[PDB]
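Anyone? Bumping this.
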Amino acid sequence: SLYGQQQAYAEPFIEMMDTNPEFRDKRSYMKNEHNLHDVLKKFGNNPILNAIILTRSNQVAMYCQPARYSEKGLGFEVRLRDLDAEPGRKEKEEMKRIEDFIVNTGKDKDVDRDSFQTFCKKIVRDTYIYDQVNFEKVFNKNNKTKLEKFIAVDPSTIFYATDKKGKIIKGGKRFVQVVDKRVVASFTSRELAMGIRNPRTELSSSGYGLSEVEIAMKEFIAYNNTESFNDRFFSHGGTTRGILQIRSDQQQSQHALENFKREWKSSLSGINGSWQIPVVMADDIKFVNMTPTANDMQFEKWLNYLINIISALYGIDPAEIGFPNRGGATQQQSQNKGLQPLLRFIEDLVNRHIISEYGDKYTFQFVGGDTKSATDKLNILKLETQIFKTVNEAREEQGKKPIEGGDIILDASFLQGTAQLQQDKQYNDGKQKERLQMM
Amino acid sequence: SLYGQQQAYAEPFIEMMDTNPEFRDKRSYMKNEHNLHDVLKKFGNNPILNAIILTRSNQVAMYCQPARYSEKGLGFEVRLRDLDAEPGRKEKEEMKRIEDFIVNTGKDKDVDRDSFQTFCKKIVRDTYIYDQVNFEKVFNKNNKTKLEKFIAVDPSTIFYATDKKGKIIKGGKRFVQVVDKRVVASFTSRELAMGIRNPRTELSSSGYGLSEVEIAMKEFIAYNNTESFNDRFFSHGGTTRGILQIRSDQQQSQHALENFKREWKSSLSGINGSWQIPVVMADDIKFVNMTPTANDMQFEKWLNYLINIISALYGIDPAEIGFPNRGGATQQQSQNKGLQPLLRFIEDLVNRHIISEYGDKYTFQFVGGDTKSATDKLNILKLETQIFKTVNEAREEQGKKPIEGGDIILDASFLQGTAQLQQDKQYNDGKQKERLQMM
C-alpha cells in the first residue's frame, strides 16, 4: 500500500500502540521520542541554522525568474521533452502560458498569493529544517481534470493516513492534516504533494525523511551552552580583577572604610586623577589576582569544530558563514555540491507534480550560471571538429538542420585536398571528351 | 482567506486570546512576547546594524536612475515582456512616461514628495530591520481604475485585519494601520502593498516575516555590553597603576602628607622635573601593582566572532564593515550573494505592484554593473559560432532580423569550401550548355 502492490514488506508489521489509529506518527531515529517536529521547531530559531537557511534562500532567489523575460540566460525555462523536436506556434504559446502560470502560482494574477520566489524561499526552509515539503493543489471545481492554483502547506501538521487496520492507505485520501492533535482535513495524492530529500529504507521511519537537525541535536545544544558560557562572564558575575588586602590588628569600622572610599573616589576615580598614585601607611598590603592579566574568548577551536561538522552535514562551505575551514583553503566546487542538488530536487518535484497536469511532452528546468561547463562542451566540439566531425553532422546532432556547402571537416588543409581532388578530377573527367572524340 | 479558497489550514485554528479582535498581532518566534517591533525599534539604533543598512543603501542608490537618461548602462529600464517582440512609437512613449512616473513617484513633479532614490533607501532599511515593507497607493478619485501617486508607510504600524470570527480577511479592506493601540485607517489590497522577504510556513507567524534582528538579539546585547565593559575602564574607575606603601610606626598626620604632596608636585609633577628622582629615608617602601604593565582591549576575538556571525546572517561581507573574516581572505562573489537578491526582491515587488496597473505586456528591471557575465555570454556565442551557429540564426535568436549575405558560419576555411563548391558547381553546371549543344 505504501508504494503499491508488492510481495515484500516495507512498512512496520506491528503498529505503534500509542499512536492514533487515523494516522502513522513520525518519530525519532532511535524511537526515543514519538514526537519530533515539536523539538525541531525549537532549533528552528538557531542563528547558525537560520544563517545557512537565509544564505541558501538568497542563492535560490536569483534563479527564480523566467528565462525569456530575462536579458541574460539566468532563470528557468519550459521546453519540449525532446531537445531535437521542433517547436510550434501553438506549443510555444502553451509553454509561455504555463511559465506565466508558474510565475504567478495560479491561473490569474493575485497580489494576495505567493510569487514563485517566495514559494521557493519557503521550500528551502522546509527542506533544510524538517526534510519534508508539502504544497496543496486547487483543482477547478467546474472541471476536476484541470488545475487552478497551488500553494505551500507547513509540513509539521501533515502526516501519512492509515486505514482501520493501521496500514498506510494508497487509494483515495492518503495525506491528513492535524492541528493540536485533532484531525482537520485530508487530501488525495494528486491534491497534495510530498517531497522527501533524505529518504530511508528502514521500516522504523516508514518513509519519513531524516532531518539533519536531529543528527546535529547534540552539537546544537553544545554550541548553545558554549555561547551561554562565554556570555555569562558579562551577564553574570565573576568579572573581578583582584582583591586589595590591607593587614590590620583590628578590622576598620565601616565609617572609616566609607571615608576611605570617599577619598579614593575624589582623588583617583575616572579620567580625573587617572595617572595619580595614592599613599597608604599600613603594616602590609597585598593584591591577589582572581582573573588573568587579559581575558579572551574560550573554547574557540571547539566552536570551529562544531560549526564545521554542522556545515559539512548540510554541505555548505563554512567560509560562507564566517568560520574558518579546519582543512583545505585555510567556490565553484562548493557551489556544485551545495546548491545544484537542491535546485535539481526542486526541479524534479515541480516538474513531476505540476507539469503532469498539462502533458508528458513538456518539462521544467533551470538554466544559467554554468558558463564554464558549456565552455568545456563547446571546446570538446571545437577540438572534435578539426579531425573527426563534419559541420553538418554536428548541426544535425544538436537539433538543427544542415547548411548548404558540403559536410566539410574544418581544416584549411582538408579543403585544399578536396579542391585539389575535384580540380584534378575535372581534368581527368574532361578526358572522356577526347575518348568520345576518337569515336 | 489568508491566501485564497483552499482545503488545508494555513492560519491558527484558535485565535490568540489577548489580541484585539480587529487584527492579528505579530509576535516573537517562541511566543515569548506578543509585541515585537517595539523591542526591534530599540535595536534599530545599533551602529553595526546601521552601518550595514547605510552601506547597502549607498550600494542601491547608484542603480536608482533610468538607463536611457544615463550615458552608461547602469540604471533601471522598462521594456516589453517579450524581448523578441518589436517596439513601437506608441509603446516607446508609454514606457518613457511610465519611467518618468516612477522617477518622480507620481503623475506630476512635486518637490514635497520622495524621489525613487529616497524611496529605495527607506525600503532597504525597512527590509533589513523589520523584514516587512509597505507603501500606499493613491488612485485617481475621478477614476478609481488608474493610479496617481504612491508613497511609503512605516511597517511597524500596519497589521493584518481580521473578521468578526478573528480570521484574516481576503475581500475588501485587508490591511489596517494602528497607532498607540488605536485603529486609525484600513486599506484595500490594491491600495496597500505588503512585501515579505523572509517568509515562513508555520501557523504561529501567520505569514509575518522573520527579521534577522530577532535572531541576533542575544548577540546584539552581548556586543553592546561588551562595548560597555571596554568603555567602563575610562568612564568608571579602576584605572590605578599601583599603590606606594611606606612603612612607619605611626600613620603620618594629614598635614604632613599634604606637605609631602606639595613637595612631590613642586619637584616632579608635569614635564617640569619629569626625569628627576626623589629620595626618601623611611624604613621600608613597596610598590604593589594593581593593573598590568600595559593595557589593551579585551575580548577582541569574541567581538570578531559576534560581528562575523551577525554579518553572515545578513549576507554581508565582514570586511566591508571594518572587521576581519575569521576564514577565507584573511568582492564580486560577496556582492553576488549580498546585493543582487535584494535588487531582485525590490524589482519583483515594484513590478507586480506598480506595472500591474498599466498592463501585463510591460515589465520593470535593473541593468548594468554585470559586464563579466555579459562578457562570458558573448564568449559563449563567439565560440559557438565558429563551428555550430550561423550568423543569421544567432541574429534571429536574439530578437533581430537577418543580414543579407547568406547564413554563413564564420570560419575562413568554411567560406573557401562554399566558394570552391560554388566555383566548381558553376563549372559542372556550365556543361549543360554542351549537353544541349549536341541536341
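Late reply, but here is one note on the structure posted above: Chain A touches chain B through 125 residues (CB under 8 Å).
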